[PDB]
Design a protein around this nucleic acid. Structure first.
Ligand SMILES: [Mg+2]
Ligand SMILES: [Mg+2]
Ligand SMILES: [Mg+2]
Ligand SMILES: [Mg+2]
Lengths: 292, 294
RNA sequence: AGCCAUGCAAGCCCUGAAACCCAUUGCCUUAGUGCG
DNA sequence: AAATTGATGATTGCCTTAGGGGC
DNA sequence: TTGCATCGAAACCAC
DNA sequence: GTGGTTTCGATGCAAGCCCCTAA
DNA sequence: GGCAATCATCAATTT
C-alpha cells in the first residue's frame, strides 16, 4: 500500500493520495504501508518508522524542477513522481539523540555569538549577565555532546585520538553527515557536502538557482581544517603544506593557494571519515592516521 | 578647525585629513574642532559632543554615489565632499537612554521569537528553561522602557491617551525617529520613513540599489496601524475604513485596498506625530487634527 | 489636503570514480530626509 | 590534593558572490 | 512548512 | 484587598519580491 | 565599521 502525502502542520492544508482518491487525514501506522512525501518532518513520520512503516522523502525542489518541463493537486504530482522517477525517493531514518544535543548546542552558540557582538558594539550589564547565562547553556550542552559521544564509535575509536579534534568537531561531523549507508561513494559525500567539481567549476551560491548541497558541512569542514592547521596535526598538516606549496605557482595571490589547500585537506578528511565509518558499520569498501 | 576622519575601531586603520596633511590620531576634544565623518559611532564622537565640538555625519552612500561621476585617500574625499556639498552633512547628537533600553529590549525580543520558533519546531527541556529566562529579560526590559518613557513629553502628554498605544509602540516610534527637528516638513519624514511618492511610484527595496529610507520606521508604523485596526481606535479606524472603501474600486483585490488604507493611515499618524513632536519641542508648524491633542 | 502595496525570524531538505580536475560561512552595530 | 573551571597560544590570509530555492 | 510584530480587559495570584 | 502578573480576545488577509548598500 | 567558527596546555580555584 503506497500513500503520497502533501504534508503540513495545519490540518486544513494536509492531503493524501492513494493513486485513485484524496484523503484529508492519515491512518494508524502499519508495516503494510509505504509513505512517500516531499520532505515530511520526523514529528509526523516517527510513529510510522517506529512500527516499520517505511517513509520515503524527496527534495523540496523536485516538483518545482519537474515543473520546468489548489495545493491538493501537488499530492498527485508527488505520487506521479514516485511512479515516474522512483530514483529520487530516499528512506527517512530516525535520528540519534546526539543530533538534538548538537542542534541545541549550536542554537545556544549562535545566541552567544550574537550576544558577544552586541557587547562589542556597546556595553550594558543586562547583556553581560545574559551573555553569562548563554555561555553556561552552551557549556552544559557541550558537556552533553561530550557525554553522548560515548555512544558513537567513530569518536571513541578514532576522532578522539586525532590531535585538534574534540567533541564539537565530532558532534557536528557526525550529526551533519549521519548514517553512512546514505553515501555509496566518497564522491556522493563530497557532492552532498559541496566539494564536487563540474568541468573544473566548483559549486557556488547563485541567486535564482537552487543549490544542491548541504553547505553546513562545507562550513564545518572549514573549521576542522582550521584546527588541523593551528595544531599542526599529523598527516593533515603535511598535506596542507604540500598542497599550499604545489598550488601557489598556479594562482594569483596566496589566499587562493590557501583556499585550495584547505579544500584539498577537507576533501581528504571526508574521504577518511567515510572509510572509517564504512568499516565500523560493516558497509562496502572501495590512509587515516590512527585507524588499523 | 575642520578635520575629516575615515573612522575605524582599530587605530592602525584610523586616518584623519586636516586639509593639508594626513594624521593617524585625533586631538584632544575642544569646541574649536569640527569633525566631519561618514557614519562615525557615538563611542568615538561622544567625547567631542560633550565639549561642544560639532560632529557632522553623512550617509555611507554619499561618497559611493559621488564616485559614479592609497586606501587612506577616502579621508580626503570626505573632506572634499564636505567642501563642495556640506548640505549632505548633518549634526550628530548624543542619544537618549531610552534608545539603549529599546535596543536591548528588541535584542531580547528577537531572541525570544527565535527561541519560541525553535520550541514550535521541536520540544526540549533545555530550550523551555531558556525560553522562560529570555521571556523574563524581555519583560524586565519592557518595564525599563515603560519606566523611561516617563521622561518623554510626547508619550505622557499624547501617545499615552490614544487607545492601542503602549510602551513598545511609543518607545519604538520615539527612538526610531529620534529628534523631530531633523525633519523640517512632514514630507521629509514620509521620505525618511519610506512613504514618499515619485511620479506615482512608492519606495521599494531593490537589489543593487542602496535604499534611502529607514525601513524600520515603516515596519513599526505597520504595527501601530495594525493596533488601531484591532482596537477600532477613534479617528484612525474611521480613516482606515473610509480609505479602504474609497480605494477598493481602484485595485484588483481586498489585500491591495488594505495595504493602501494602511499606508494612508500610517502617513496621517506620522503627520500627527510630527505635528505634536514639533509643538512639544517648540519648532515651527506647517501642514485631520490629532485626536487627543489640544 | 492629492498622488500611494511594512517587514523580521525559525525548522527542515539537498547525494561527481579514492588519482587529477578544485576559492566555506554565520552574525552584529550603525546610517539613510517628496512636490507644489 | 583531585575535579572543575579559566585562560590563551596554535596559524592564517585579505577576490567576488552577497548570494540557494523550496516545503 | 511555520511563528512573530501589540494592547486592553478579565481573571488569577501572592503577600 | 491591593498591587502585580497571566491569559486571551480583537481584526485582517492570503501579491510579489525577498528585493538595500555602505562604513 | 566589527566578531565568530575550537582545541590543547598550563594554571588557578573550590571543595
Ligand atoms: Mg506541499
Ligand atoms: Mg538550529
Ligand atoms: Mg574607510
Ligand atoms: Mg539590536
Amino acid at each position: 500500500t503506497i500513500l503520497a502525502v502533501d504534508w503540513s502542520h495545519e490540518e486544513r492544508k494536509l492531503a493524501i493520495f492513494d493513486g485513485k482518491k484524496i484523503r484529508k487525514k492519515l491512518p494508524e501506522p502499519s508495516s503494510d504501508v509505504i509513505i512517500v512525501a516531499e520532505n515530511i518532518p520526523q514529528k509526523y513520520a516517527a510513529p510510522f518508522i517506529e512500527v516499520g512503516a517505511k517513509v520515503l522523502r524527496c527534495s523540496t525542489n523536485a516538483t518545482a524542477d519537474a515543473r520546468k518541463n489548489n495545493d491538493e493537486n501537488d499530492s498527485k504530482v508527488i505520487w506521479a513522481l514516485y511512479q515516474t522517477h522512483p530514483e529520487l525517493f530516499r528512506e527517512m531514518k530516525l535520528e540519534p539523540p546526539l543530533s538534538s544535543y548538537y542542534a541545541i548546542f549550536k542554537d545556544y552558540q549562535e545566541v552567544r555569538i550574537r550576544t558577544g557582538n552586541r557587547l562589542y558594539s556597546d556595553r550594558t550589564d543586562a547583556m553581560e549577565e545574559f551573555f553569562k547565562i548563554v555561555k553556561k547553556g552552551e557549556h552544559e550542552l557541550k558537556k552533553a555532546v561530550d557525554k553522548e559521544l560515548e555512544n558513537h564509535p567513530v569518536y571513541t575509536q578514532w576522532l578522539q585520538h586525532i590531535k585538534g579534534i574534540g567533541p564539537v568537531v565530532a558532534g557536528g561531523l557526525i550529526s551533519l553527515i549521519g548514517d553512512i549507508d546514505r553515501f555509496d561513494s566518497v564522491s556522493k559525500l563530497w557532492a552532498y557536502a559541496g566539494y564536487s567539481v563540474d568541468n573544473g567549476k566548483v559549486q557556488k551560491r547563485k541567486k535564482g538557482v537552487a543549490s544542491n548541497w548541504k553547505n553546513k558541512i562545507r562550513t564545518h569542514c572549514y573549521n576542522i581544517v582550521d584546527s588541523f592547521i593551528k595544531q599542526r596535526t599529523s598527516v593533515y598538516r603535511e598535506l596542507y603544506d604540500a598542497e599550499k606549496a604545489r598550488q601557489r605557482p598556479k594562482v594569483e595571490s596566496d589566499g587562493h593557494a590557501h583556499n585550495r589547500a584547505v579544500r584539498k585537506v577537507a576533501k581528504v578528511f571526508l574521504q577518511h571519515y567515510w572509510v572509517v565509518s564504512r568499516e565500523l558499520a560493516g558497509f562496502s569498501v572501495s590512509k587515516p592516521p590512527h585507524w588499523n
